[PDB]
């Protein structure tokens, strides 16, 4: 007869599973939070990139407009040069 | 024979464990798909960033090349004025 | 004697331990993928720091060149007026 010790052996086994499950709840919770930290880090990095990009886009536009404007001044200077070279051959 | 209710108590606990495990299957399934979306999102940002820098680098190169030609045109032009100024002191006055 | 059922529960506990053992694997991989992705982000942040400081200097260095070159353009335009003014002193 007897065999009543086995009743506790399964009761003990269920405690092992509850403890092992309790870690599983724990491990998943971090992975969730760790994932959230990365998605937050990425989204904020995206925001700083948009600003830092809009700045360099504006600077590229201001400098490139200046470059094209200076091409006009080269033509205006060249126009005045054609007049002068013709004028010097009009007399010593 | 003195506690047959325990026969059912274990059947209840096994059901608790199966559902609790079923949750773990779901949480990992969600975590897996969410992870894949992030790894894809990261991959797309890497590619789009490569372009926008390669784009602006071309503008920086073409704009700086424009400067180098314009300094040359300015240097030859400044030479052209110095030669002219030298001729003016040789002219009758 | 209900000894057939006592083993039936022992079998189910083995099923769960295997299912738990898989969960350890799935969590371990997901952990590493997070570390790899979080690693991918950090190098991307650093690479942006370098690539931005370069282009920011190039925009500043080129724009400083513009400011010097616009000065040189004004001196050139003055000397053309200088030459034309001397030619108008030959008439007079």
Residue numbers in the entry:
A (entry chain C): 285 to 376
B (entry chain A): 285 to 377
C (entry chain B): 286 to 377
Anything the authors wrote about it?
TRAF7 serves as a crucial intracellular adaptor and E3 ubiquitin ligase involved in signal transduction pathways, contributing to immune responses, tumor progression, and embryonic development. TRAF7 is a noncanonical member of the TRAF family, with a long CC domain and distinct WD40 repeats instead of the TRAF-C domain. TRAF7 contains a RING domain, a ZF domain, a CC domain, and seven WD40 repeats. Somatic mutations within the coiled-coil (CC) domain and WD40 repeat domain of TRAF7 could cause brain tumors, while germline pathogenic mutations contribute to severe developmental abnormalities.
The structure of TRAF7 CC (fragment 270–379 aa) was solved at 3.3 Å resolution by X-ray diffraction. As predicted, TRAF7 CC forms a parallel CC trimer in the crystal, and residues E285–L377 exhibit distinct electronic cloud density and form coiled coil. Using the multi-angle light scattering (MALS) assay, we demonstrated that both TRAF7 CC and TRAF7 ZF-CC (fragment 221–379 aa) independently form trimers in solution. Detailed structural analysis revealed that TRAF7 CC comprises 10 regular heptad repeats and one hendecad repeat interspersed between the heptad repeats. The helical diagram analysis revealed that the residues at the a and d positions of the heptad/hendecad repeats of TRAF7 CC (residues in yellow in Figure 4A) are predominantly hydrophobic residues, which are mainly responsible for forming the folding core of the trimer. Charge residues in the e and g positions further stabilize the CC structure by shielding the hydrophobic core from the surrounding solution. MALS assays showed that the L322R and L347R mutants displayed significantly lower molecular weights than the wild-type TRAF7 CC. MALS assays revealed that K346E exhibited a lower molecular weight compared to the wild-type TRAF7 CC, while R371G did not present a significant difference in molecular weight, suggesting a weakened stability of the TRAF7 homotrimer caused by the K346E mutation. The results showed that the Q310L mutant behaved similar to the wild-type TRAF7 CC, while the elution peaks of the F337S and I368S variants were shifted to the right, suggesting weaker interactions between the chains of the trimer, indicating that the F337S and I368S variants likely form the trimer with lower structural stability, ultimately affecting TRAF7 function. In conclusion, our results showed that TRAF7 CC region formed a stable functional trimer in solution, and the formation and stabilization of the CC trimer are crucial for zebrafish embryonic development.
